[PDB]
Amino acid sequence: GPSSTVTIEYFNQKKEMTKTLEEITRDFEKENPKIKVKVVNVPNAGEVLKTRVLAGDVPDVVNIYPQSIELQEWAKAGVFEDLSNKDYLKRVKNGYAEKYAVNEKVYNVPFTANAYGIYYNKDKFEELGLKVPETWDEFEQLVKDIVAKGQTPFGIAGADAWTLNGYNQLAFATATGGGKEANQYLRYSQPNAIKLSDPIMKDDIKVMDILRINGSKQKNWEGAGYTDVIGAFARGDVLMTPNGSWAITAINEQKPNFKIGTFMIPGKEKGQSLTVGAGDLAWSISATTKHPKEANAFVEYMTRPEVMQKYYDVDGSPTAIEGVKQAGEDSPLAGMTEYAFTDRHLVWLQQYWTSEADFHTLTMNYVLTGDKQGMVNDLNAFFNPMKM
Ligand code: NA
Numbered sequence: 001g002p003s004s005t006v007t008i009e010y011f012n013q014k015k016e017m018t019k020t021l022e023e024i025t026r027d028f029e030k031e032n033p034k035i036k037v038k039v040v041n042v043p044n045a046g047e048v049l050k051t052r053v054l055a056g057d058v059p060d061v062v063n064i065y066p067q068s069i070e071l072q073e074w075a076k077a078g079v080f081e082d083l084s085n086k087d088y089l090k091r092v093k094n095g096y097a098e099k100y101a102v103n104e105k106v107y108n109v110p111f112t113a114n115a116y117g118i119y120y121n122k123d124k125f126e127e128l129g130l131k132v133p134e135t136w137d138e139f140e141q142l143v144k145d146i147v148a149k150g151q152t153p154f155g156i157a158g159a160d161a162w163t164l165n166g167y168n169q170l171a172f173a174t175a176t177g178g179g180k181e182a183n184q185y186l187r188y189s190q191p192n193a194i195k196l197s198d199p200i201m202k203d204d205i206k207v208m209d210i211l212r213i214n215g216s217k218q219k220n221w222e223g224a225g226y227t228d229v230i231g232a233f234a235r236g237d238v239l240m241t242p243n244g245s246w247a248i249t250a251i252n253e254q255k256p257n258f259k260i261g262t263f264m265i266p267g268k269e270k271g272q273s274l275t276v277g278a279g280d281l282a283w284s285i286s287a288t289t290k291h292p293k294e295a296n297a298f299v300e301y302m303t304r305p306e307v308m309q310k311y312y313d314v315d316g317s318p319t320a321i322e323g324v325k326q327a328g329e330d331s332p333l334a335g336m337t338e339y340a341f342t343d344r345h346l347v348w349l350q351q352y353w354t355s356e357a358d359f360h361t362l363t364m365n366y367v368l369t370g371d372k373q374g375m376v377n378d379l380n381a382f383f384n385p386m387k388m
Pocket of ligand 1: 004
C-alpha cells in the first residue's frame with residue numbers, strides 16, 4: 001500500500017552547530033513522525049551548493065548567506081520559494097528579512113546574524129583604569145595609554161587579512177555616515193573617484209592608523225593567524241582584538257582567566273558607533289522541492305521561540321526571532337550586539353561587490369606598510385572593475 005514518509009534535506013553551512021541542529025531535527029521528527037530531515041554537512045559546502053544548484057539539484061531547505069551574490073542571482077532565477085507571505089516570517093524582527101529582498105520579495109529567513117567589533121579584557125581595563133572609547137580620538141588614546149602602561153593593545157592576525165574586513169568597512173561606514181553612504185563612496189562612485197585628498201579617505205586613514213600606533217600589536221603579528229590571535233587574547237597577552245561575533249566560542253574554549261567584553265567601533269563623535277554583519281543561520285526553501293509542506297514545516301519549527309532558544313543558548317549569535325531570551329548585559333557579545341537588527345547594524349558592504357578578498361588584502365597591506373597612496377590606488381583597482 002501507500003507510505004507517506006518523506007525525506008527532505010537541510011543543506012547546512014554552520015558546521016560548528018551540527019550537534020544542536022541535529023538535536024533540533026530529532027525534536028522536529030518526534031513532533032512529525034512522517035517526516036525525516038537529513039542534515040547535510042559537506043566539505044567545501046559553498047562550492048558544493050553552487051555545483052548542485054547549477055545541476056538542477058537544489059536541497060529542499062538551504063542554509064545560504066543572504067548577502068551573497070548566489071542568493072541574489074538564484075532568487076532572481078526562481079530557484080527559491082517566495083516566503084514573503086509566510087505567517088512564520090512575521091517572527092523575524094521587523095525589517096530585517098527585507099534587507100535581502102530581491103525584487104521586493106523575501107526568499108530567506110535570517111534566524112541569526114553575525115556582528116563585528118572589538119573584543120576586550122574587562123579585568124585589565126578595570127585594573128588599568130581604562131574605558132571603552134566613544135570616538136576615534138578616544139580609541140587612539142586608549143591604544144597609546146595601553147602601550148604606555150606596558151601592555152599590548154591588539155592581537156592582529158597579519159597572515160589572515162580577512163579578520164580586518166569588518167574593521168575597514170566600519171572605518172568607511174563611520175567616516176561616511178552609514179553603509180549605503182560607504183558604498184556610495186567606494187562602489188557606486190565614478191571610476192578613479194577615490195583620492196588621497198578626499199576628506200573621507202583621510203578619515204579612513206585615521207581609523208586604520210589606530211592599528212599602526214607604535215607598540216600597538218603583538219610581536220610577529222605579520223605572521224600571525226586567526227587562531228594565534230584568539231589564543232593571545234584568551235591568555236591575556238593582548239588586551240583587545242578586532243573580530244566578529246563568530247570568534248566567541250573559540251575564545252571561550254581557550255579558557256580565559258578574565259571576563260570578556262566587546263565594544264562597537266566608534267565614530268568621529270559620540271553616539272555614532274556602528275557594527276556590520278549579515279544572516280548566518282539563514283534558510284531558503286527550494287522552489288522545486290517535491291515536498292513543500294514538509295520543507296515549510298521545518299523552517300516554521302525553527303522560528304518557534306523554544307526551538308530557536310536551543311540554538312541561541314549554544315551559539316550566542318544575535319537572533320532576529322521573536323520571543324527568544326537573549327543574553328544579558330554582562331555577556332561577552334553585549335557591546336557588539338547592543339544594536340543588532342537596528343539601523344546601526346549594517347549589512348556587509350560586499351553584498352553589493354563582485355568579490356571581497358582584495359579588500360581584505362589592501363586593508364592588511366596598509367597595516368603592514370602605511371603606504372597611503374598605495375592603499376588609494378588598491379581601492380580604485382578593486383572597485384573600478386565593478387563600475388563597468
Ligand atoms: Na504515499
